[PDB]
Amino acid sequence: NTFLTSSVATPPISVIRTGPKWWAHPERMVRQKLMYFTLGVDQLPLRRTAVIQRDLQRFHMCKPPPRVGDSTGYKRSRAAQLNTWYRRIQYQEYHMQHLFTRHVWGLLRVYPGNTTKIQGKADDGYVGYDSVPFHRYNRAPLPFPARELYERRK
Amino acid sequence: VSTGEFDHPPFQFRQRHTFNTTPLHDANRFGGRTAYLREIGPVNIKKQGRRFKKDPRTVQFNVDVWCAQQTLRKRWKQRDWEVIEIPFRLVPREQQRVIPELYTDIPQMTDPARNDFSNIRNKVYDREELQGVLFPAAGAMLYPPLQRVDKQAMTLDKYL
Amino acid sequence: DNLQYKRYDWQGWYQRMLDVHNRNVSLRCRICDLQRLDGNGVQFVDMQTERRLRILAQHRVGMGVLKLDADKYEDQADNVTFGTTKLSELLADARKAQLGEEYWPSVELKVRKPSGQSKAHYSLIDNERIEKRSGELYEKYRDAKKRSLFVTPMETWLEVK
Amino acid sequence: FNEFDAKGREYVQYMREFARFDPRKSRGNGQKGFPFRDAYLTKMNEANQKTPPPTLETIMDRAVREHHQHARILSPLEVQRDVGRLEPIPSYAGKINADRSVFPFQWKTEDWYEYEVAKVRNRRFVFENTEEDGIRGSEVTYKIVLEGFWDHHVMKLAEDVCMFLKDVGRQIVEEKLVAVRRLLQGGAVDPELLAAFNCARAGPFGGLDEYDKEEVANFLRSDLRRLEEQCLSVINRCNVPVPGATNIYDPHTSWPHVEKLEPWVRMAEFWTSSSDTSFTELEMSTAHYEFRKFFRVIICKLPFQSTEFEKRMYDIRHWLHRQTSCEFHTIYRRNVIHDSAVFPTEHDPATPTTHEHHRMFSFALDWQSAPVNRLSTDTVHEGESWDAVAQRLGCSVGELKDANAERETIEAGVVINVPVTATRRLTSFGATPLVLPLKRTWEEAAAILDCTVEELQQCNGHAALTYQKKESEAGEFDSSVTELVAPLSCWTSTSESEFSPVERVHANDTLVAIARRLQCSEEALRAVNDGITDVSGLDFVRVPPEARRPRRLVEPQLRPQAATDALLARTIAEEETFKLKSIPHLPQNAERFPHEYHTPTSRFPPTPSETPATQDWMAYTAKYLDKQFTISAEPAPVYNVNKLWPMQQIPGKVDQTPFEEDQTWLLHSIPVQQLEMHHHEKDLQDLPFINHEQFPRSLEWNAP
Amino acid sequence: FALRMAVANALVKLIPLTRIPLKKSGLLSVDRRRERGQFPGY
Amino acid sequence: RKYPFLRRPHIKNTHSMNPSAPYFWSFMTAKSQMAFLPEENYITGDWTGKFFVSKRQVYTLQHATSGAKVRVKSFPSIFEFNSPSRWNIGKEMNTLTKP
Amino acid sequence: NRPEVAMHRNTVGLLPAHMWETDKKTGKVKSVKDSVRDYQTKTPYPKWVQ
Amino acid sequence: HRPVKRLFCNIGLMGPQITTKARWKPYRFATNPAGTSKAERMYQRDKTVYTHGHN
Amino acid sequence: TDRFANSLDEYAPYDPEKDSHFHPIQIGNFDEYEYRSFLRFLINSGELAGLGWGPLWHASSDFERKLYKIGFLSGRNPQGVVDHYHQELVWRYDYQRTRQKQYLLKRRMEGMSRGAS
Amino acid sequence: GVHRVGYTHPSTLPVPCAQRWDLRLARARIFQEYIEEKAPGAWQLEDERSMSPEFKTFTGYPMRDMRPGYGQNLPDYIMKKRLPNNTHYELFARRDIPNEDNAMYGKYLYDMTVHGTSLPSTYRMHKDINKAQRNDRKLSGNRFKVLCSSGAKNPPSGWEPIPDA
Amino acid sequence: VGYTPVNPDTSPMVAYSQYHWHYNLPQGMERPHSVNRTFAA
Amino acid sequence: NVSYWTMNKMVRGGNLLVHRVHYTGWGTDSHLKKGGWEHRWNKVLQRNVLQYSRI
RNA sequence: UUUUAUUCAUAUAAUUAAUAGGAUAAUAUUUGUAGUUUUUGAUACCAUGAUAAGGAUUAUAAAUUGAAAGUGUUAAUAUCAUAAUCAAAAUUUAUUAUUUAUAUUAAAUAUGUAUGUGUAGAUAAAAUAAGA
């Protein structure tokens, strides 16, 4: 797309921990919903993470209930189970978002950023006009007309 | 109102290209005008590096002047007219008055007694009626008369 | 001054600095007050004279009040006479819109571009000659196509030195 | 007030004043003339004029509830939420109709911007001394600004000075009221006043104004009644503030009233660690302190000029409070005489001045300081008669004889005084140079020209270079020098060397318009044009000498060339001696490189070359593509069209209007700011964080 | 949030009985939170 | 320690690098080449002898044609511009020192 | 020409290519000959002066 | 690159798309010689010549 | 984030009466009836086609709340209706379902207590 | 775009009127305004940061010239700039004296009026007292640094310093 | 304190000390001095 | 017009009349609170120059 | 048998004592006021103050939009009141929080060298209009 420079990768836990700033930003979530809808597939994981984020952000101000009253034997384990279950749902949504972004890029002839893999037509990470002459993680030298991934016309 | 940005992002530690973070002088910002301020590559501050590309004031003024140029071009694209000097005798009654200069009076109105309250300085007159004054010697048939739809006519839109 | 810049040596230059800083003199004159009959028997400023005066004083006139702020000289005694002289010059030049209509300032009128209904005839001007030329241009186009795969408008009608 | 809070009291006041706002009343004052912007702009917005009716669903639901269910739908205001009380229905239950023109406020961005800028600009354009009755309207206005280190100090000083000025003004206005009443009881009309009234040559009824003592006394009585009313208003507003209830800030309640002003607060930010530790530690050890100065403004609006009151208010600086200062602003009515003699009204010169006369340093080189010297003396010529002199000077015989009545007759050569209101008065230092022909030395030439020898030498210039040591050698070189130019001080004007000999006829000027413009008779114009009665036949029509209103050659207040030639005479002599034909400022192929050779006055973006067919698509078609096009260009009007608006670029100069596409702006040669920002007025104050203020005046200080 | 608070106050001024629901929902409750001021130390 | 932009308290800290071919004129010199030479190139009054020319003086042809010795102040006691050439014309002395 | 607006207009004719000895194999400038020696000038000072 | 973009803007047959829709190579990539075919060309240019990246 | 990436750079006023030879027909935004039908189709057909909340239907309010809220958000402009129909996913201050869940839970707790007693 | 600005004379006009360029020339003559000829028409940049009410820093006046290549060297800046005479610089140059009690009055005159003799500085007095105490204690190790050594190297006739011990 | 004496005019300490007038007072005129009229020169 | 050390000494002593505010704020001034040093700079310029008619 | 970051750049050169008023004022050449030469702490020493680091805990429930940042000491440093032979213009001299790939030098002389899969050890910071 318009962003073609080198990029670093971050664990999904970091983006999930980022709340209603990037991961749960309503505009970005609406864009993801539009991407799913224009492809005509259900947005079940997106809606699950949306309701999870809404519930979390609504009560983030409130103080936690007294932990002494809660039973460490069972209540703490139940809370950890629920937190892990929510985190797994958000992981699934994150993976789905990345997969569908790659797929839409491939369909629309959109050249991704450097070292970005688009299954079906790159399969090893497209790199073009990078600061390093060689392909990162592959050590393959790169030509100046970097790579024509798609057909010329249109 | 406006939705875009007008102020240059502040100088901090090096911004890595990741989620919700962009390099400070990436080609996306300001359309492509961060190219002027971009100091490509890792820079050793001891010897390499131009001062003005790091000075927060000069880059801010550059962003301001770029935004001013953008505002000027977007404003001028709205112009579907030109200003012509008329000898004050052939203008209609709504123009035969003491029009104050810009920023020297309250926004005036064209003949408020005629139930017209629009700004007088933003009135635009078509040539279909002004051809007589603009081109008296030419005559002939230039800019044929503008057909005006009859409001009081039973057409399809009137549920005829 | 009355606090610490009196009764001593620095008081003099402090007072001189204050006077130089406050040398500005503002002269205000109303257009309604100007619109009176003069000694000769005519109105001192008419509608055209007022319009010319407003054009001459782009920002010096405002809310119907002509204001001239003179900081020309270090003292108000000379600022006032400079302001009166400049106001007299401005009035003399503005009264010029009474000797004839040639001195009447023109109204800057926003005249629109020709509308779409007028623009629609741009295709139909010289229609018959255009079609007659187009027939022989098609003849030339097919003659060129008989020998060339791609024919540019340069071959048919475009002219390049 | 118990009715509303601060914002309620503000917006209700805004609505009330807009409900009776009238644009005509806005003249004179400043920001007070601007109405409530929210309602004014929404009234000026055309889209708000059309108010959509209630929707079909709304009207159908209301009709079903009323005519079918027998239950009229209650408005939210009239319906009662309280389950324990029946509150009375407010009068504004459903009576107030809905209109987009009034509420809510919707405006357009251009109108909003223009209104805001105009309201900011028009603040000092307030006419304080008017003829209005009430709080406003007076003769003199005094604004005393009291400055103190502490707010309560300046407040108490304001109260003390206000009470003192209240007493003093009551005394002065009381004595003035006594005088006004005594004048109103009876008086004698001043003969000087009657003569002043009887001074207009033509009155408002086409003739003399026969003003008598009865009418002048009536006008004086009206003025005295107005003055008495104003004095009574001042006294009544001054007699109000008893100790029990005193409102010093209200103009109606107290005189003189006091109004607040924003204090001058200047923060100083400095490091506080005496230890010269690291920069981070120094920055962490940073404290903010500020210098404060508090101001109060006292306004005294008196209906007359009172020197005693001015003295008593000036002398308050002697008994001001501790560590308190004061400054005085005076706004008084004055009379300014504008005579048509030193600043006359006439035709523009035949050859108008161009932009080249308005250049940098041009004000000191080719522009005199107005008014220009117009000659009042005149030397009568041989053969000119009493009426001929008046005709030549463009004045009446009666005016001429009134100007020179001590002389019964005018001799062949006499120095007379032209009437002050003459329309054909010459101008000193006529443009025509004076030439002396010698056929002889420098001393003889100076004696015959009545000029100093040094001035003659410096004005001649080349004569000095040609002449050697001996006056005999100077006389020998006089043959080569031929005519000598007289000094500028010796030049004399002529009755025909100042006014245009021919006049330019307009497109639609007949034989009457030209005569009217020149103030001559049609028969005289026809006789001076050799009897031709066709204006269209000739492009230029000569102006007869009988014209009362001629056209000058050039601008009268224009410095001649000799004036600056005397300023730089030695440069001319040196250049003539050294034979400096030209000084090439640019190299050979300077224009070859369009970016290296930039003058300090050169600007960006550079203007591309002009093409004779890029004005419009019709011209482009007629030139290049389909040259068989009948129409040459678009039907341009006969009147001037300004492409760059509201700019006023010099005509005949190739220029480009602001670009409309981002590509042009981006790819055009436009630099960036690489050094410090420099401002002509902000060269002082140094930079931000180094802001310099000589005087700690309030930031929103209003000049008189 | 500022717009919501202003509208809630306007509603309370207009219809007095609407004060109870908005107050119970905490729409007229202002928060005194403020962004950190400028300081060269940080 | 930080100081206002283009107002560094150090005046000689400016290290004039090797001259750049693409500009070679819009760097360490006058912004316009139609401006007059600075005052250091000329003699104001009757002096008794200049110790060494300052580094702000521009280089001219007369420096190499006249043959008179020219020297400037640098890290050592003095530096004389021995072996005059014509390649350095239109440039100031500060661009030919490399401190 | 500076590369700001016009750089492609530079031509080798502007380059003297005679006051230096260049590498006949690579093309780089190997050495530079003396320039002040027997320099040819019509007027060391501008013609109009003196 | 600079004169190419200026020519594309002057011809106007493409319109305002040059800076809004058209994409162009970076500075040091578009300053390469005519035939390179290798991304490791900007690092192989002459280093002894002080020309601010102009070969 | 820019919804107007492909929008035209015109900024030009247009008057069909003065700029066309055809009869102008003015079309306004949806009224109450058309807006209700349009929104009912979008929500219910989307849910039936598998493009709506589906199993998470209880996460969003009922149709009446959606119709009321979206109408305010869009102003009954058909494009605004579509946009806010998609943007409904990020609604934060809709407490209808939360209150109903508490009320129904309270109802069943009382019902179980009545059955036990 | 690129074009040539046209001017039409009132005499050539079908109906005469005062042209805006002529009015501009008259106003420039009245107010002694320098008409800049090389001002490009495509640089009508509004200082939006100070003119737009939508901005925080709105002031209603253009606070910037919007020219990147603007400095104090150019003659336009020289002509339209403000001289520092009678400014805060002039105030500081006379008020920021290291010794405050010297801008009001001369120290010698003030001493000769209020007191009978000119007093020395506090530091000078402290040095004199310390010298007195040192002379009382030791009376050795002191130098004889003076301004003029003539009176010490050639003492006046009849001068005999008495010894100490 | 110090070789440089304090300025009694602008120093808040001496201005608001016990021996001078504090800023929480009416700040009226202390005494109506008249020198030139009692004994002119 | 004194150094930071001198100003700090005079503030800690009773030699200057200043009013202490928060060390990490903008102060009492509305121009400072509504834009900062540059805004107060512009306001000072407007008061000094950009309010007169300048005949 | 919880979260964030860290490659940081100038640094020495030589001389420091006094007061003296002008137009519209009833008179001052005081226009133009003339008595060399007996003293000595910092061109390099004042030790004493501030600062750095930096913590404390009562507000039940209803109402209200409310009723809510505070420092010793230990340390280092330094230009102040305290102990005579010498740093501030001729600056190289190494002094923490920097612009990374569509377009890159026009106004006071304003930076040509560190691309290498962003890969160590240590160090600092915060629960403050944000969303552990």
Sign, CA torsion C103/C108/C109/C114: positive
With the C-alpha atoms ordered F73, F79, F84, F88, is the resulting torsion angle positive or negative? Answer: negative
Quickly list DSSP for D13-55: HHHHHHHT--GGGGSSSSGGGS--HHHHHHHH-GGGTS-PPPP
C45, C94 in Cβ contact below 8 A?
yes
- In this structure, what DSSP letter does residue D77 have? T
Amino acid (one-letter) located at J96: D
Nucleotide nearest to B17 (CA to C1'): M100
Note whether G4 contacts D: Cβ–Cβ < 8 A.
yes
- CA-nearest of C57, C53, C59 to D345 is C53
Dist CA C141 CA D115 (whole Å): 61
Structure tokens at C130: 């255009």
Judged by DSSP in three states, C90 sits in: helix
Which residues of D are less than 8 Å from C84 in CB distance? Answer: 336
Q: How far is C145 from chain J (nearest CA, A)?
A: 39
Q: What's the maximum distance between 2 C-alpha atoms anywhere in chain D?
A: 129
- Specify whether the CB–CB gap between C153 and C134 falls below 8 A: no
Which residues of chain C are within 8 Å of residue L52 when distances are taken between CB atoms? 24, 26, 69, 71
Closest alpha carbon within chain D to F5: D676
Count CB-CB contacts under 10 A for residue D58.
Answer: 12
Alpha-carbon distance C64 to D125, whole Å?
8
Which nucleotide is closest, CA of E35 to its C1'? M129
D165 alpha carbon, distance to own chain's centre? 36
CB-CB contact of L19 with D290 (8 Å): yes
Measured between beta carbons, the chain C residues lying within 8 angstroms of I17 are: none
The structure's method of determination equals: cryo-EM
Tokens representing residue J101 in the block: 């009690």
Answer for F48: CB within 7 Å of strand M: no
DSSP F79: E
Q: Which residues contact K34 (CB under 8 A, 6 or more apart)?
A: none
Nearest by Cα to D264 from D232, D230, D224, D292: D292
Q: With beta carbons less than 8 A apart as the criterion, state whether D456 and D449 touch.
A: yes
DSSP string, D106-138: ---HHHHHHHHHHHHHTTS----S-S--SSS--
Is strand M within 7 Å of residue B48 (CB)? yes
The residue count of chain K comes to: 41
Q: At what angle do helices J20-31 and C76-94 cross, to 10 degrees?
A: 160
Can you tell me the distance from the alpha carbon of D347 to that of D394, in angstroms, rounded to the nearest whole number? 15
Contact partners for chain C, using 3 or more CB pairs closer than 8 A, are: B, D, I, J, L
Q: Which residues of H touch G7 (CB under 8 A)?
A: 2
Q: Are F14 and D697 in contact (CB under 8 A)?
A: no
Query: Nearest nucleotide (C1') to the CA of residue B25?
Result: M99
Listed residue (D223, D24, D262, D257) closest to D141, CA to CA? D257
Sole residue written with tokens 């001394």? D129
Question: Residue J132: which H helix or E strand, with range?
Answer: helix J122-137
What's at C53, amino acid-wise? L
Query: What does the alpha-carbon distance between residue F46 and residue L35 come to, in Å, rounded to a whole number?
Result: 56
Containing D268, the helix (H) or strand (E) segment is strand D264-271
The closest alpha carbon to F91, from F55, F42, F43, belongs to: F55
Q: What is the CB-side half-sphere exposure of residue L38 using CA atoms within 13 A?
A: 12
Question: For D74, which DSSP code?
Answer: P
Angle between helices C76-94 and C47-56 (to 10 degrees): 130
Kindly state the tokens that stand for B146. Answer: 């503008």
Q: How far apart are CA D265 and CA L43, in angstroms?
A: 12
The answer to whether the beta carbons of residues F88 and F55 sit under 8 Å apart is no
The answer to whether strand M lies under 7 Å from the CB of residue J117 is: no
Contact residues for A74 (Cβ-Cβ < 8 A; gap 6+): none
The strand ranges marked E within F12-82 are 71-72, 79-80
State both tokens at J162: 């008495």
Nucleotides of M under 7 A from a protein CB: 2-6, 8-11, 17-20, 36-42, 49-53, 64-66, 76-81, 83, 90-92, 95-118, 128-132
Maximum pairwise Cα distance, chain F: 47
Mutual angle of helices A26-38 and I78-87, in 10-degree steps = 110
Q: Resolution of the coordinates in A?
A: 3.6
Nearest CA-CA partner of D493 in D546, D435, D550, D432:
D432
Q: Residue B17, CB, less than 7 Å from strand M?
A: yes
Q: Other C-beta atoms within 10 Å of D340: how many?
A: 18
Q: How far apart are CA D701 and CA D147, in angstroms?
A: 12
Chain G environment of F64 (Cβ under 8 Å) = 36
Tokens describing residue B6 = 């007008």
- C45, C53 contact by CB (below 8 A): yes
The residues pairing with D259 across neighbouring beta strands, listed in sequence order, are D297
DSSP conformational letter for I86: H
- Give the residue from I18, I19, I25 with the most B CB atoms within 10 Å of its CB, the best one to mutate: I18
Contact F24, D589 (CB under 8 A): no
F1 touches strand M (CB under 7 A): yes
* A119 within 8 A of A107, measured Cβ to Cβ: no
D139: closest CA among D307, D377, D326? D307
Nearest CA-CA partner of J40 in D601, D596, D614 = D601
What count of residues does chain B have? 160
- Residues from chain H that touch D666, judged by Cβ atoms under 8 A, are 19
Identify the helix (H) or strand (E) that includes residue E9. helix E2-14
Taking C1' of M109 and every protein CA, the nearest residue is F28
Q: A87 is written with which tokens?
A: 């985190």
Interchain proximity D77–E17, CB inside 8 Å: no
Beta strands D654-656; D502-504: pairing state: unpaired
The Cα B148–Cα I17 span in angstroms is 7
Does chain J reach chain L with at least 3 CB pairs under 8 Å? yes
Picking from A71, A87, A73, the residue whose alpha carbon sits closest to that of residue A12 is: A87
C1’ M32 / CA C16, Å:
29
Given a contact cutoff of 8 angstroms between Cβ atoms, the answer to whether D153 and K27 are in contact is: yes
**Inter-chain contact J15–B89, Cβ cutoff 8 Å?**
yes
What 3-state class would DSSP assign to C112?
A: strand
CA B145-B146-B152 angle, 5° bins? 120
Q: Does the CB of B28 sit below 7 A from strand M?
A: yes
ω into D104 cis (within 30 of 0): yes
- The D residues from 494 to 553 touching B (CB cutoff 8 Å) are none
- Strand M within 7 Å of which CB atoms in H 9-48? 18-19, 22-29, 42-43, 47-48
Total Cβ atoms within 10 A of residue J99? 10
Closest by Cβ to J50, choosing from L1, L42, L55: L42
Q: Which of B61, B119, B138 sits opposite D677 (nearest CB)?
A: B61
Please name the amino acid found at residue D687: L
Residues in chain J: 165
Could you tell me if D502 and D542 are in contact, meaning their C-beta atoms sit under 8 angstroms apart?
A: yes
CA angle A46, A47, A52 (to 5 degrees): 100
Q: How far is CA G38 from CA F64, F84, J100, in A?
A: 12, 14, 68
**CA–CA distance, F34 with D148 (Å, rounded to integer):** 55
**Distance between alpha carbon A12 and the CA centroid of its chain, in Å?**
7
The candidate with the shortest Cα–Cα distance to B100, out of D41, C33, D125, is D125
B49 part of contact set with chain H, CB < 8 Å? no
Helices D453-460 and D442-449 cross at an angle (nearest 10°) of 100
Using alpha carbons, select from F51, L24, B77 the residue that is nearest to residue E39.
L24
Do at least 3 CB pairs under 8 Å connect H with J?
Answer: no
The DSSP output letter for D695 is S
Q: Is J43 within 8 Å of J50 (Cβ atoms)? A: no
Q: Which of D264, D267, D296, D152 is nearest to D697 (CA)?
A: D264
Q: Which residues pair with D289 in a beta bridge?
A: D268, L20
Q: Give, in order, the Cα–Cα distances in Å from E33 to each of D152, E26, E36.
A: 32, 16, 10
Q: Could you give the C-alpha distances from L54 to C27, C59, D42, D126, L45, in angstroms and in order?
A: 11, 10, 35, 17, 15
Instruction: State whether D596 and F25 contact (CB < 8 Å).
Output: yes
Report the residue from F26, F65, F85 with minimal CB separation from G2: F26
Bridge partners, residue E36, by sequence:
none
Distance CA G9, CA D436 (A): 60
Contact K3 J123 (CB under 8 A): yes
Bridge partners (DSSP) listed for residue C28: C67
CB distance C46 to C98 below 8 Å: yes
Between the two ends of chain C, the Cα-to-Cα distance in Å is: 82
3-state secondary structure I23-52: CCCCCCCCCHHHHHHHHHHHHHHHHHCCCC
Residue in the structure block whose two tokens are 């020179």? D404
Integer CA distances (angstroms), D434 to D460, D489, D492, in order: 12, 10, 8
End-to-end CA distance of chain E: 29
DSSP 3-state of I7: coil
Nearest-angstrom CA–CA distance, D595 and F25: 12
Cβ of D689 near strand M (under 7 Å)? The reply is no
CA dihedral A132, A135, A136, A139 (to 10 degrees): -110
K and G in touch (3+ CB pairs within 8 angstroms) = no
CB F84 within 8 A of CB F49: no
Residues 2-41 of K with CB under 7 A from strand M: 2-4
From I50's Cα to the closest Cα of chain A, the distance in A is 6
Residues 6+ apart with CB under 8 A from C116: I18, I19, I20
d(CA D426, CA D377): 10
- The answer to whether the beta carbon of residue B37 comes closer than 7 angstroms to any atom of strand M is yes
- Separation of alpha carbons A70 and D164, rounded Å: 77
Q: Which residues from 599-618 of D have any strand M atom under 7 Å from their CB? A: 599-600, 602-604, 606
CB B7 within 8 A of CB B59: no
Of B68, D378, C39, the C-alpha closest to J51 is B68
Residue F41: phi and psi, rounded to 5, are -75, -10
Q: For residues L34 and L23, what is the distance between their CA atoms, to the nearest angstrom?
A: 18
User: What secondary structure does DSSP assign to K1-41, as a single string?
Assistant: --SSPP-TTT-HHHHSSTTS--TTS----S-----TTTS--
* Phi, psi (degrees; rounded to nearest 5) at J62: -70, 115
L8 CA: nearest nucleotide by C1': M50
At residue A129, the 3 state secondary structure works out as coil
Structural contact between residues C50 and C35, judged by C-beta atoms closer than 8 angstroms: yes
**Residue located via tokens 């008189």:** D704
D254 neighbors D246 (Cβ within 8 angstroms): yes
CB contact under 8 A, K3 and J100: no
Interchain proximity L53–C86, CB inside 8 Å: no
Nucleotide in closest CA–C1' contact with F73: M90
- Measured in whole angstroms, how far is the alpha carbon of residue B33 from the centre of its chain? 20
- Give me the J residues in range 11-40 that sit within 7 A (CB) of strand M: none
Tokens found for residue B53: 């590309």
Q: Which residues pair with D233 in a beta bridge?
A: none
Q: Which strand (E) or helix (H) includes residue A14? A: helix A12-17
Rounded Cα gap, residues D358 and J29, in angstroms: 7
Burial of F39 (0-12, 13-18, 19+ CB in 10 A): exposed
- Residue K35 CA to residue H18 CA, distance in Å, equals 86
DSSP assignment of B110-160: S-GGGT--SBSTT--B-HHHHHHHH-TTT-SSSSPPPP---TTS--TTTT-
State the Cα torsion A75-A79-A84-A86 to the nearest 10°.
140
CA J2, chain centre distance (Å): 46
Quick one: CA torsion of H7, H11, H16, H17, rounded to 10 degrees? Answer: -70
Q: Do A143 and H37 touch (CB under 8 A)?
A: yes
Taking any CB pair shorter than 8 Å as contact, residues of chain F touching chain H are 17-23
Return phi, psi of residue D489, to 5°.
Answer: -65, -20
Amino acid identity, position B32: G
Instruction: Centre a 10 Å sphere on the Cβ of residue J165 and count the other Cβ atoms it contains.
Output: 3
Cα C140 to Cα D487: distance, rounded to the nearest angstrom = 80
**Rounded CA separation F26/D418 (Å):** 65
Using a 7 Å CB cutoff, list residues 87-106 of D near strand M. none
Nearest protein residue to M51's C1' (by CA)? Answer: D273
Helix, strand, or coil (residue D593)? coil
At D315, which amino acid appears?
D
Q: Which residue is nearest to nucleotide M100 (CA to C1')?
A: B41
Chain J neighbors of B1, CB-CB under 8 A: 54
Q: Which helix (H) or strand (E) holds A36?
A: helix A26-38
Please check whether residue D279 is in contact with residue F2, taking contact to mean a CB–CB distance below 8 angstroms. Answer: yes
Read off the amino acid at residue J68.
P
Cα–Cα distance for residue pair D358/D352, rounded to 1 Å = 12
Report d(CA J94, CA F79) in Å as an integer: 43
Evaluate whether G25 touches F74 at the Cβ level (below 8 Å).
no
For residues D453 and D620, give the distance between their C-alpha atoms in angstroms, rounded to a whole number. Answer: 66
Helices D471-481, D442-449: crossing angle, 10 deg rounding: 70
Look up tokens 């040819």; give the residue.
G40
Q: Are L14 and K7 in contact (CB under 8 A)?
A: no
CA pseudo-torsion sign H41, H43, H48, H51: positive
Give φ, ψ of D598 to 5 degrees: -115, 120
Instruction: Output the CA–CA distances (angstroms, integers) from residue A19 to A88, E1, E31, in the order listed.
Output: 15, 19, 22
Please list, in sequence order, all residues whose beta carbon lies within 8 angstroms of the beta carbon of residue B120, skipping any fewer than 6 positions away: B94, B99, B108, B109, B110
C-alpha–C-alpha distance, residues D6 and D2, integer Å: 10
Task: Give C91: exposed, middle or buried? Use CB within 10 Å, 0-12, 13-18, 19+.
Answer: buried
